[PDB]
Amino acid sequence: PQITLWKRPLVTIKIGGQLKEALLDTGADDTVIEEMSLPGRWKPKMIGGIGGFIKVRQYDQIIIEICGHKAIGTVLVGPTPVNIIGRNLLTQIGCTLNF
Amino acid sequence: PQITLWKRPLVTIKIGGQLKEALLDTGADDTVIEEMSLPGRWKPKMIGGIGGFIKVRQYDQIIIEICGHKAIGTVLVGPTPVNIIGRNLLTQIGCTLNF
Ligand SMILES: C[C@H]1CNC[C@H](CCc2c(F)cccc2NC(=O)CC(c2ccc(F)cc2)c2ccc(F)cc2)N1S(=O)(=O)c1ccccc1
Ligand SMILES: [Cl-]
Ligand SMILES: [Cl-]
Ligand SMILES: [Cl-]
């Protein structure tokens, strides 16, 4: 699809068999989602935002569907204001910015 | 142009007669630039997200040039860790997400 930016680019994602809403964010290096249970071991990670840095849990090789497109990669879990799909997964689904 | 997301989508912008590097961020509602002087009236605003909130100065009707494309809109100025071109100005240059 072609998504304009007059409104927030919110799409449906599927992770752990559950549908959630997430923001497609070209300004985020990584994908970060609100608290939920993910399988496997996690590693520590710090991510920096507008207001400073936060600690998150890093899960690797997580299956996630984004607007119907399959991705498998790193998902961070932490106290984010909204679920965010960052460049690590936007590249997997072949997303580009065009003007 | 078509910009891939293998690395941060950093572009050169021209604002207040200064050349600056800024991130094209579909996850940002507003455009926020590091401390600089801008002409006209301003009002305080709080913007937030990962890490919490920061106080910024809101300047309206500011002209920006992004990749040769002129756009006018509100520009927030404050202690952001990176200059961000948010949706309020990405729409004006006809920027879309495509996959
Ligand atoms: C550097 C950029 C890159 N991601 C976007 C974000 C924009 C911040 C921003 C601006 F810059 C300029 C003007 C406004 C704002 N804020 C919003 O638009 C609010 C928004 C939001 C989005 C992501 C957040 F994390 C936090 C909040 C929001 C959407 C839906 C909702 F219901 C409630 C809030 N920042 S970040 O937090 O630092 C960050 C850095 C690394 C990874 C993730 C995020
Ligand atoms: Cl990944
Ligand atoms: Cl505006
Ligand atoms: Cl349009």
Put simply, the answer to whether B1 touches A80 (Cβ < 8 Å) is no
Give the determination technique. Answer: X-ray
Continuous segment of H or E residues that includes residue B71:
strand B69-77
Q: Which residue is it, tokens 């400073």?
A: A52
Task: Label residue A75 exposed, middle or buried (CB < 10 Å: 0-12, 13-18, 19+).
Answer: buried
Nearest residue of A to residue B80 by CA position? A50
Task: Label residue B22 exposed, middle or buried (CB < 10 Å: 0-12, 13-18, 19+).
Answer: buried
Q: What spacing in Å lies between the alpha carbon of B88 and ligand 3's midpoint? A: 5
Nearest residue of A to residue B82 by CA position? A50
* Ligand 1, atom 9, residue with closest C-alpha: B28
Instruction: List all residues whose CB is within 6 A of at least one atom of ligand 1.
Output: A 8, 23, 25, 27-28, 32, 47, 49-50, 80-82, 84; B 25, 27-30, 32, 47, 49-50, 84, 86
Contacts (Cβ under 8 Å, ≥6 apart) of B68: none
Residue A18 maps to which CATH number? Answer: 2.40.70.10
In order of A19, A42, B19, the CA distances from A58 in angstroms are 20, 5, 37
B4 touches chain A (CB under 8 A): yes
Active site residue B30: no
Terminus-to-terminus CA distance in chain A, angstroms?
15
Nearest residue of A to residue B96 by CA position? A4
Resolution (A): 1.5
**B24, B48, B53 member nearest A26 (Cβ):** B24
A81 touches chain B (CB under 8 A): yes
Cα three-residue angle B10-B16-B19, rounded to 5 degrees = 35
Q: What is the span of the domain harbouring residue A65?
A: 1-99
Number of domains chain B is built from: 1
- For residue A95, the SS3 value is coil
Contacts (Cβ under 8 Å, ≥6 apart) of A27: B8, B9, B23, B24, B25, B26, B27, B28, B84
